[PDB]
Copies of this chain bind each other. A is one copy, B any other.
Amino acid sequence: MLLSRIKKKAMELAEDLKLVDFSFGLPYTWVLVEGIEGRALGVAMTLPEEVQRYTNSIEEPSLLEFIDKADSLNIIERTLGVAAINAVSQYYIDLREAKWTELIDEIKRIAIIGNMPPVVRTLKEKYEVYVFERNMKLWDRDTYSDTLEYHILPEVDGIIASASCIVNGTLDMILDRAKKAKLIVITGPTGQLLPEFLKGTKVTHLASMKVTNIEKALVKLKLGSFKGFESESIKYVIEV
């Protein structure tokens, strides 16, 4: 599992960081950390439809304990672990010259994992697009089942996968089936991880967002507002 290798690298970076606060909440599970330079907020998308039991083996919460359960069979332990990996990453992230869609000549067929209407509408006009959605709420008249990813991914030149593919563990399959993909973009707040963690993989770019105001974003994360949390952050694209 790729998430098992990412947590090993992240635990080496969490040595000088401490856990401040956390919450397995909606729409995002977040982990607040603190170092000598200041604080950092890491998030991971909560997928309640994947939750089988509301249990957690973690008795004493800590940053190293959260990161160690990132490859757990328990989705609650994974989401808190990925959020913690992102929290350590957002503390050490270098976004100096980070690019702001026009990232895609070269590409003819695109596979979009996770229904993102603004991204889909822009690409459906100029490229052959295949949208895959698992959640029934985000279903369009153009969306296909996620069971068809295994068969369509080897035929596409570009892949735009929702960063939620990291928490549900579907990232390992997406990369394995990306036989002919020249571009693989992991987009969303769950993609807050360091690009060095994905070195060697087929992932080409990471499109996420860094929290500019931790206090205001925490208020919006606790209130369950995605746009409110998004407005307290800056969107970035960094090459792996």
Contact = CB atoms under 8 A, between A and B. Distances in A.
Interface of A: 1, 21-27, 46, 48-56, 58, 61, 73, 75-76, 80, 136-137, 139-141, 143-145, 147-148, 150-151, 168-170, 172-173, 219-220, 222-228
A45 to B, nearest CB: 11
A222 B21 CA distance: 9
A24 B25 contact: yes
A222 B139 CA distance: 24
A184 to B, nearest CB: 17
B53 A151 contact: no
A225 B52 contact: no
Nearest to A50: B145
Which A-B residue pairs are the 5 nearest by beta carbons?
A25-B25, A24-B224, A136-B136, A48-B48, A56-B223
